[PDB]
């Protein structure tokens, strides 16, 4: 309701033929209960390419649920997310 | 086209905890769309952080605003910085 | 000398209440700093979070074994905030405690 909970899900794309470009295109071509906000993010650098999603939830349980719209990205990239983090929103 | 920067502190080396920073917070800029404080607890360790939403990559690379006070509260600069392009948002 | 520890817990997953919201209410409505109930040495509110699931609870230190098994005192407001009675009760003997 007022306290929000954040889940961050990240894929390192070093071990995948998918890139930020290819995944941006699949997003271009191709309302969940409890979910206030869903954001797709990316990063490029010497470290390598990364794809991810940031979820704002209105309940603590949902934050640990299987993240929505991840199954489709899993088969596109080739594997389970390399990183997953859990936060509380303290002030926005 | 928006950009997202996140600044984090591992709190294990500070007297500060998520709880004490939360309490302090409770009792107390060009290009910047949104500023959000975040925290993390559990077996992996305590963290405090700020998430910024920018509309330019320059401002995003600029030194994070409103971080000065927190650096004083924790006792050191952020231990981790990450930089993202926003691809899509609801 | 012999003390008895009763722990009552609420699983919060079925409730609109959360650790954050219970903690916020507590912050704006301070509980008694001292014990009122005869035989009650100490009362502590506790919480847990993370993948296991959210929980709220009360830990009681009693000087008699009868009270340890009675209805736990001072939980009426929390029961109203959560919307149900404790989902779990545990009974312990204190075998040794540091001072």
UniProtKB/TrEMBL annotation, chain A:
<protein>
    <submittedName>
        <fullName>NosA</fullName>
    </submittedName>
</protein>
UniProtKB/TrEMBL annotation, chain B:
<protein>
    <submittedName>
        <fullName>NosA</fullName>
    </submittedName>
</protein>
């Amino acid at each position: 309701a007022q306290q929000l909970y954040c889940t961050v899900v990240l894929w390192d794309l070093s071990r995948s033929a998918a890139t930020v470009a290819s995944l941006r295109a699949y997003l271009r071509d191709h309302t969940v209960p409890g979910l206030r906000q869903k954001t797709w993010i990316s990063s490029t650098g010497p470290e390598g390419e990364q794809w991810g999603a940031v979820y704002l939830w209105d309940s603590p349980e949902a934050a640990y649920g299987r993240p929505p719209g991840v199954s489709k990205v899993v088969e596109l990239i080739g594997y389970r997310p390399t990183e997953r983090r859990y936060y509380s929103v303290e002030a926005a």
